[PDB]
Scaffold this active site. Structure first.
Site, PDB file in Angstrom:
ATOM      1  N   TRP A 156      43.610  41.406  44.586  1.00 48.80           N
ATOM      2  CA  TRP A 156      43.848  42.772  44.194  1.00 48.80           C
ATOM      3  C   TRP A 156      43.191  43.686  45.234  1.00 48.80           C
ATOM      4  O   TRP A 156      42.346  43.239  46.038  1.00 48.80           O
ATOM      5  CB  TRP A 156      43.392  43.059  42.738  1.00 48.80           C
ATOM      6  CG  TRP A 156      41.951  42.863  42.421  1.00 48.80           C
ATOM      7  CD1 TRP A 156      40.993  43.811  42.457  1.00 48.80           C
ATOM      8  CD2 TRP A 156      41.292  41.655  41.972  1.00 48.80           C
ATOM      9  NE1 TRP A 156      39.784  43.292  42.091  1.00 48.80           N
ATOM     10  CE2 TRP A 156      39.932  41.969  41.796  1.00 48.80           C
ATOM     11  CE3 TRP A 156      41.708  40.344  41.720  1.00 48.80           C
ATOM     12  CZ2 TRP A 156      38.997  41.052  41.366  1.00 48.80           C
ATOM     13  CZ3 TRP A 156      40.754  39.414  41.298  1.00 48.80           C
ATOM     14  CH2 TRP A 156      39.412  39.787  41.129  1.00 48.80           C
TER      15      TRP A 156
ATOM     16  N   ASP B 224      38.920  36.435  46.253  1.00 46.14           N
ATOM     17  CA  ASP B 224      38.009  35.555  45.554  1.00 46.14           C
ATOM     18  C   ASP B 224      37.616  34.398  46.459  1.00 46.14           C
ATOM     19  O   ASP B 224      38.274  34.123  47.472  1.00 46.14           O
ATOM     20  CB  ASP B 224      38.655  35.001  44.299  1.00 46.14           C
ATOM     21  CG  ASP B 224      38.848  36.041  43.220  1.00 46.14           C
ATOM     22  OD1 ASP B 224      38.144  37.088  43.223  1.00 46.14           O
ATOM     23  OD2 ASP B 224      39.682  35.883  42.312  1.00 46.14           O
TER      24      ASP B 224
END
Lengths: 109, 361, 119, 360
Positions: free
Chosen positions: C49, C68
């Site tokens: 994101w 991540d």
């Protein structure tokens, strides 16, 4: 009173009390399996003053219940006295060895 | 502009590293090893160890060995007990070694997962619930075979003066010694005389381990000795940890990995608490006592910080203690230990901490 | 302001640090990594994101990419849940209630980074 | 002599049961569903759901469905995304249904894991990260259809007035309706006109779901409606949740599963907090507002207890709220909700609670 770690029958419990986990003192929560093997405790009955053999069968095949953890050690001994010892997973020989909770089954005097 | 990259090594050098084995008992299927820098309390990384992992570091300091249990669908499906080999510096998985589906599942006492002095074999406790000791050949990445001679015994104490020998504590109150051959099979064995009365003075399994002998403390605060300088193990004891005052206030030992030995000085470290009675052998430390094993007298006592487990580094003269969540770092270069720092929140539920090995040849 | 490695660690390890304005998860800089490097043995996500965050030190706005690090279990340290300009899943790449490890070889979520893309 | 037995059923009747989906985000590989009796707070059992599980109960109340991800060695090895079917009374595993390795991994909004009104099909959100809707045939135990028409859309809102129809919210600000055939394949579809401006007034995905319409609240406190009494969905809005005094204190909605509808009265329940600004849309409730959807006016407001998610039981006139850890039980048979009890420590990290279905 059975959900307290101080309850007399729980004198050698290392784990979560099954009676707090949707089971009872002598029955596994739905969908967990009794261990055929167990460590054994000798606990003092405060009512009649006699000592009783309690068999600490685990209930197995579900992940940790997480409620009513107890770590009581009356007459508990190390692994060289293996069936008196409670720092091992008594689910170890079940079809699934994941530890869910512990029961406190009264054997007799 | 910036780019995220992986493939990095641990930021602090090996000599700064410690390993906190977090059982995460509340969620025991997600146990892990937390790697910390003991000099500054910094979190350095971690190794996931699934259900009730155990851990050690290879004697040569290059690899982390874990031991764990998987199932195909976690709470159902086929079981796989394994040893895994991880690179210490990259904290990456390298190799899985298959075990028979009976590796010990239990709390993290040192002696359940050890290696021979020469580093060539991993030596582990089995329980089916029948007990045997498992031997893994590190070079081959293989399981050798069960040491069935160790039935009715428990835990592994390596003999640091021999390349592939270890002892185990037996239900008769004596020690069984196993001497492996070059292939990891039992070459010879011997059994000591009774060291302790199992009924009257049971010992804690954690050794205070010297190069050619080992000391053990009992539920009632006595000390027993196993001397393996010779091929036959010579057993002695008891002598009491306690003076008259100590006895009057019912001081006894308590904990898990509850003792340690500083080999150069012969100082033995022991977690102790007052008002001992049946059922208090795993109580947190009110104090740490430091014993001279030569004079058989206490030379120091300090606050226990509710510690349950410890470990010693011979090479930097340090002691770590662990209360389940927090790690305390002590200087033990003098008789009285000095507290250097505390690492808060190193684990949720750990009963074992270990240094990254330095030297030790 | 633009170079976390030259900054105070305490500052970059805080949920209030300017570029962490749409972080949902554990900061990798508290997990043995840094703002722009995964902890050892964890793998960057190729997708993320994206947030737009204001830099109060230089008064400019920057695109941040929240990759991540994946394939290790939860780091557990420095959990943040900041939601500046975050939107629901029908604006998918602005959304932070999904695991951006979802497309990695192993999707287990370890920690989140805040990578500065540009103005 | 006592004998330990297994094989036992849940001790309380189905109608007493609620399901608290515990993500256990601190140890997300050991997520689970905790089953509680809402009448007395008693823990009844649990179902393990591995990494970031999702959960629902079959509309007929007989089975529990979970959705999860396994790997051969957890953090390495081959991925398996699955739906599992569990017996609701014995809390035992019955069947695994294989999914393609793209089931949604994310927090537990209701709309990510749903079923058709007739209970015959499970309808789930995929993200690879390209989005599509996956259909599972319960009777066959098979993944039967991948609705790629829903690309760029998100979440599943079943239509309670049709047997196999549902809607999803799309990036154009409209809704896509999918009508499945009796084989679980798409039989028809339609797209509404734009309901809301994605840029200027984004909605929360959580529906306040009536039998033939659904209401949605926005980041700025407006309400939008979708009427599906007909084959073509008709959309309208906004009307504001807020009066002038409310606006002066910058009240806006906040939370996750943050709304609910009491179908008999048309009351809509919404978690609200003051001092709204960019970035506060997942803030815990300062208050629950009770809105009359017919008059488009608030009728009551009560303390929010820092709640983040809710759910409604129509037939017993109940609302549950959930703050991550604790579950509050409210009587909503009258316009002002009445707090009956709080179940403390029902989860470590839950954003979803659901009643056992009693409506069949």
């Amino acid at each position: 009173e059975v959900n307290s770690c101080d309850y007399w029958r729980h004198c050698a419990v290392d784990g979560f009390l099954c009676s707090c986990c949707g089971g009872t003192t002598t029955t596994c929560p739905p969908g967990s399996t009794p261990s055929p093997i167990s460590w054994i405790g000798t606990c003092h009955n405060p009512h009649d003053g006699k000592d009783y053999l309690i068999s600490y069968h685990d209930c197995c095949g579900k992940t940790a219940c997480g409620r009513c953890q107890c770590n009581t050690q009356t007459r508990e001994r190390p692994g060289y006295e293996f069936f008196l010892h409670n720092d091992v997973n008594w689910c170890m020989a079940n079809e699934n060895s994941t530890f869910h909770c512990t029961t406190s089954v009264l054997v007799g005097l | 502009r910036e780019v995220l990259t992986g493939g990095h090594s641990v930021s602090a050098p090996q000599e700064n590293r410690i390993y906190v084995m977090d059982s995460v008992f509340m969620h025991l299927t997600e146990s892990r090893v937390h790697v910390y820098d003991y000099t500054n309390g910094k979190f350095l990384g971690m190794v996931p160890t699934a259900f009730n992992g155990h851990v050690q570091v290879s004697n040569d300091g290059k690899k982390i060995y874990t031991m764990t249990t998987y199932h195909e669908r976690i709470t159902r499906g086929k079981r796989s007990d394994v040893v895994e080999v991880w690179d210490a510096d990259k904290l990456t998985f390298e190799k899985e070694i298959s075990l028979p589906p009976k590796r010990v599942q239990g709390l993290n006492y040192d002696g359940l997962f050890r290696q021979t002095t020469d580093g060539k074999f991993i030596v582990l406790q089995n329980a089916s619930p029948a007990t045997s000791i498992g031997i893994v050949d590190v070079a081959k990445g293989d399981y050798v075979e069960d040491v069935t001679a160790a039935a009715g015994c428990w835990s592994v104490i390596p003999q640091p003066n021999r390349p592939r020998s270890f002892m185990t504590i037996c239900g008769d109150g004596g020690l069984l010694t196993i001497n492996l051959g070059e292939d990891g099979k039992v070459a010879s064995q011997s059994r000591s005389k009774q060291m302790f009365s199992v009924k009257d003075d049971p010992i804690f399994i954690a050794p205070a381990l010297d190069k050619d002998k080992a000391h053990f403390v009992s539920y009632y605060g006595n000390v027993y000795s196993a001397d393996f300088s010779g091929d036959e193990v010579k057993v002695d004891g008891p002598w009491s940890l306690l003076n008259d005052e100590d006895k009057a206030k019912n001081w006894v030992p308590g904990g898990y990995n509850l003792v340690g030995l500083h080999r150069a000085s012969g100082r033995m470290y022991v977690f102790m608490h007052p008002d001992g009675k049946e059922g208090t052998h795993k109580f947190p430390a009110a104090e740490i006592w430091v014993m001279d094993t030569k004079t058989k007298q206490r030379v120091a006592r300090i606050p226990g910080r509710d510690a349950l487990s410890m470990t010693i580094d011979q090479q930097r003269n340090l002691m770590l203690t662990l209360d389940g969540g927090n790690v305390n770092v002590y200087d033990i270069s003098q008789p009285e230990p000095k507290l250097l720092r505390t690492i808060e929140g190193a684990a949720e539920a750990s009963l074992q901490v270990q240094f990254h090995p330095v030297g030790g040849t």
